[PDB]
UniProtKB/Swiss-Prot annotation, chains A, B:
Residues of the whole record sequence present: 1352 to 1765 of 1953
The protein, known as: Protein BNI1
Protein family per UniProt: Belongs to the formin homology family. BNI1 subfamily.
Domain FH2 per the UniProt entry, residue ranges: 1-410
Note: Each FH2 dimer contains binding sites for 4 actin molecules.
Subcellular location: Cell membrane; Cell projection, Ruffle membrane; Cytoplasm, Cytoskeleton
Subunit record text: Homodimer, and possibly also homotetramer. Interacts with PFY1 via the FH1 domain and with actin via the FH2 domain.
Annotated function: Required for the assembly of F-actin structures, such as actin cables and stress fibers. Nucleates actin filaments. Binds to the barbed end of the actin filament and acts as a leaky capper, slowing both polymerization and depolymerization. Protects the growing actin fiber from tight capping proteins and so increases the time of elongation and the total amount of F-actin. May organize microtubules by mediating spindle positioning and movement in the budding process. Potential target of the RHO family members.
Domain remark in the UniProt entry: The DAD domain regulates activation via by an autoinhibitory interaction with the GBD/FH3 domain. This autoinhibition is released upon competitive binding of an activated GTPase. The release of DAD allows the FH2 domain to then nucleate and elongate nonbranched actin filaments.
Length: 410, 410
């Protein structure tokens, strides 16, 4: 069954070929005809029909449906292109021009959720100005204007031409492009932020000075404890609590002693304060986070790949005739995935080392708590010492300028 | 080497028996003696010694080191026990008394991070009033008061007696207890919130009415489209866009037609609005979240188990003589893990069904986007109809009270 004249064409996404669904039955016909015979259908032959002449006649208006909020961001985030025309601008993006890709401010923007997310409402309004492109290989071929976007502001015109007509894959277009111009950095940033953990590990690992100080502390300890607490060693918890027991004058704490009881007798040890340098350089790094930042770095690539292979980028016809996303991603992905793995190891490696070091000091390793605070406990203690020592360097040159002065007076 | 008198005992966590660490060497001795011969050690024999008489003499003061903020929460969150004495209160918790466990307000509180987390500082201050318990089986045996907590406020006294002396395992004591009195609920809440997804699934699954309406829509569609868009079916995206094409009077949209073109000819279909009831009852449920809420429900148990087996609850001596955490958990855990699995399946099952239904309607299933919005798209459309129909029920009784009235006037 067919009408007789030009009717309003319906813009929809069909299932290319009848799949394993609710389709196939054929009731699509047992109905089509059934509605034509009963005439009802015929009604629709009317009530729905094409339009004609109306030309331009620049209303003198200009509209916008966007939050005044949004409308603002497009003029801001996209100012360096104020000089270009909407038409000549979408061209700048669709083609993925050098200056565009090298500008994060933009990519980040063209990708913000709140900018792509399109309300049922918002869509409805534009519909009359939209376009399909799905099944369109050239710009001159897409004819259906439906109305005219020039009757919209630069803002809306953009928003439409992009997050609207290409809603079919925008998010996923950008979600890739973001990576296509990033992994490199993301990698480096990540990797370096990773080197800085091994270093901090190595130090603790190979630096007997510390180990020594520890025994000295152990030694003293055993002594200072009654006939029973004959300890073979202590857990790290203890380092913080060395500044807990003060003398009798409440002037210097047990730690102060140690530091001196060390610099006075085996001053060859205090080289450790300069050896655990990195352990302080990276006590800031959330181990956990760093792990995940990577888990996600890799994951992020897996995704763009999937979308390229069987997702929203898997089908080319759907793209805007002038879109060049694939031609800018297909080549990169391997370079990326490559880094993806490279990094993946650096982790699984670094981590084990860390986990090992933990065991060495008796600290747990399966427990989350510990994993975080570990590095800290050392860094802390190191600062606890440093400070505690600068205090021992005063008392020396104090009962020095009083006993080198209680004599030149008697 | 040993001193000669009573020295200040050092509170530390030793490594029970020399392990695979930096301990064993024996330098703990090559130092101990070495410092005694050089006399230096001897010095420490002094500068550090016991105390004597000072008795009570209730200063008339009373101190607090806690943020005024914190101090507030203890009086609040713990008001129902205002009537009890600090001593008789810690007893109420350590023993895990019925009325205590059945009171979330409390458990939640005694477990807040910001309440357990103890600053280097905060610890130092209390140290003089603390206690060890590690290696203590009776309350009368723990003698070392070190000072006197009665010189502290109810607040601090609590905080000390608990998050302080039992810092060695508190968090992990509570982290369990929280579960010991929860999984039950957590389960039920979770499960029910899960039943509500299957129901919403089943409906979409077995309800031909919808399927029909869909074809009707397909039928009309094919017709309304030129000699080429011979579609076998459409993707869900389309449901929202049916309210996109309006007639010529811009009064009723393509959807309005459909609804009527349906209630007029096969009004046996509109039973679907009452059939996809649950699809609306649960369009609120974040599928993703719900999945994880469970992933975490199970995980939460794995944890308490680990901690019971080889963690901070693995060793009993470390607990306060009157603590009864294990005696209240060991028995429950299986009941829990049991639920853990039970639930675990309900999920892996429910999910597959959902994933299946998605495929049926041609919607993706690996993609995250879809998983979320799916249910919605249907629920939406259902509301799009409902509304759109109530509008068709006006135009009927409108061109009815005008043509049943344009006659009784001529």
């Amino acid at each position: 069954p067919r009408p007789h004249k030009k009717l309003k064409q319906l813009h929809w996404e069909k299932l290319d070929c009848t799949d394993n669904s609710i389709w196939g039955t054929g009731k699509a016909e047992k109905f089509a005809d059934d509605l034509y015979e009963k005439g009802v259908l015929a009604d629709l032959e009317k009530a729905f029909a094409a339009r004609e002449i109306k030309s331009l006649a620049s209303k003198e208006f200009k509209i916008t449906f966007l939050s005044r909020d949004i409308s603002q961001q497009f003029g801001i985030n996209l100012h360096m292109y104020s000089s270009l025309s909407v038409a000549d601008l979408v061209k700048k993006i669709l083609n993925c021009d050098r200056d565009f890709l090298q500008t994060p401010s933009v990519v980040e923007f063209l990708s913000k959720s709140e900018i792509i997310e399109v309300s049922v409402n918002l869509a409805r309004n534009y519909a009359p100005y939209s376009t399909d492109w799905e099944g369109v290989r050239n710009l001159e071929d897409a004819k259906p204007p439906e109305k005219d976007p020039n009757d919209l502001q630069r803002a809306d015109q953009i928003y439409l031409q992009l997050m609207v007509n290409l809603e079919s894959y925008w998010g996923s277009r950008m979600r890739a492009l973001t990576v296509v111009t990033s992994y490199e950095r993301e990698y480096n940033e990540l990797l370096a932020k990773l080197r800085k953990v091994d270093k901090a590990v190595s130090a603790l690992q190979e630096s007997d000075n510390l180990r020594n100080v520890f025994n000295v502390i152990l030694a003293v300890g055993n002594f200072m404890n009654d006939t029973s607490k004959q300890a073979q060693g202590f857990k790290l918890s203890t380092l913080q609590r060395l500044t807990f027991i003060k003398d009798t004058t409440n002037s210097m704490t047990f730690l102060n002693y140690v530091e001196k009881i060390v610099r006075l007798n085996y001053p060859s040890f205090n080289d450790f304060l300069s050896e655990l340098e990195p352990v302080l350089d990276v006590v800031k790094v959330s181990i956990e986070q760093l792990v995940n930042d990577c888990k996600d770095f890799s994951q992020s690539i897996v995704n763009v790949e999937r979308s390229v292979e069987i997702g929203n980028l898997s089908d080319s016809s759907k793209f805007h005739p002038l879109d060049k996303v694939l031609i800018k991603t297909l080549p990169v992905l391997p370079e990326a995935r490559k880094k993806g793995d490279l990094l993946e190891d650096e982790v699984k490696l670094t981590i084990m080392e860390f986990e090992s070091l933990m065991h060495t000091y008796g600290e747990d390793s399966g427990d989350k708590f510990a994993k975080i605070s570990f590095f800290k406990k050392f860094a802390d203690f190191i600062n606890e010492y440093k400070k505690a020592q600068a205090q021992n360097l005063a008392a020396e040159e104090e009962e020095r300028l009083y006993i080198k002065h209680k004599k030149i007076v008697e």
